[PDB]
From a paper:
The [name] respiratory syndrome associated coronavirus 2 ([name]-[name]-2) and [name]-[name]-1 accessory protein [name] colocalizes with markers of the plasma membrane, endocytic pathway, and Golgi apparatus. Here, we show that neither [name]-[name]-2 nor [name]-[name]-1 [name] form functional ion conducting pores and that the conductances measured are common contaminants in overexpression and with high levels of protein in reconstitution studies. Cryo-EM structures of both [name]-[name]-2 and [name]-[name]-1 [name] display a narrow constriction and the presence of a positively charged aqueous vestibule, which would not favor cation permeation. To explain this difference, we find that a divergent, unstructured loop of [name]-[name]-2 [name] facilitates its binding with VPS39, a HOPS complex tethering protein involved in late endosome and autophagosome fusion with lysosomes.
Author numbering:
A (entry chain B), B (entry chain A): 40 to 173, 181 to 238
The structure:
Amino acid sequence: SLPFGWLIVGVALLAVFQSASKIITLKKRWQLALSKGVHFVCNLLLLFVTVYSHLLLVAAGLEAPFLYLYALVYFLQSINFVRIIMRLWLCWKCRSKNPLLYDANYFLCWHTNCYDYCIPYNSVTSSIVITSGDEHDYQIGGYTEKWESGVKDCVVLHSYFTSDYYQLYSTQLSTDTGVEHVTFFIYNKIVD
Amino acid sequence: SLPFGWLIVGVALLAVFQSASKIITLKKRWQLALSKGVHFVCNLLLLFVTVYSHLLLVAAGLEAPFLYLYALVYFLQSINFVRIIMRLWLCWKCRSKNPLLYDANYFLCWHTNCYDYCIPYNSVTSSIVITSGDEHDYQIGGYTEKWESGVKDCVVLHSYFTSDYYQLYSTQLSTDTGVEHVTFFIYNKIVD
């Protein structure tokens, strides 16, 4: 007494959303969110699908070779949910919406009285270069963000669990490097 | 005369692989490949699943409200395949395996007689900073790569379609910035 067309519609919709998820380019900010939105729906759909599939086996009574598989599926989904919770915790720590949009491992962040800056970053490095200027923008590795306040002497590389501290040593003006309308700030990791 | 348990096994396996795809962290190189490998399998599974589902409708004869949906699915999958082909073309242009592993929009590349360097990059910027040194490594935005040869005066930002040229202006030594065992190279985009 369980419908089948609902299962087929759900799997078709999951295919649609997952296929569209591989088409959205991650260049502009809003598209990023849209991509995540699509992903979210896809994720939900997947859950529904597999959950519904389990119910189908309940009608079939073939749980003997599938209970381990579905336990693994639910365990991995639970780990994914914990990962989303940790992502929200990192968002709260970085007090900006950037961690949800981007998939970077680490986030270079710093606070000002009027704005908070959070930029994606791949791995912990012994030094970090912040490029201002060219409508001033702060960009790291191509990831850019609008300028509203000046830089800070100390910045924090935030992660899921650990956080590192970076201190400014050298500020490079245009007259030093020769690049027009661009200023470089150099930070290095401190040890305590 | 078409099996159903094959469909349920395929959708369960797709759920397993897609759920595991959201667990692999993108920190070390090999994991990256593994992630893509999993993704690849997931993608294939998805195709199979939806393809099989279409065949099921062939048995049902309910193509009236589903032919548009499956045409959209196949169109998006074809666009995804074209995207993979363009990714392989960009890999050949960058003549290294980095573009397959990473998901960056652009790739900063340069050739030497003994090695070719290709580093992920987010967006086209008016300037680029290459950080050498700390076992010397070249790292942009946290994405690091082993050092085997010296830098080049000209580097290329490669994309799916267009390519930009970046020329070196300033090289920052340790004695200038104060950072120990780290050297910074400054490039800017040229106009022709």
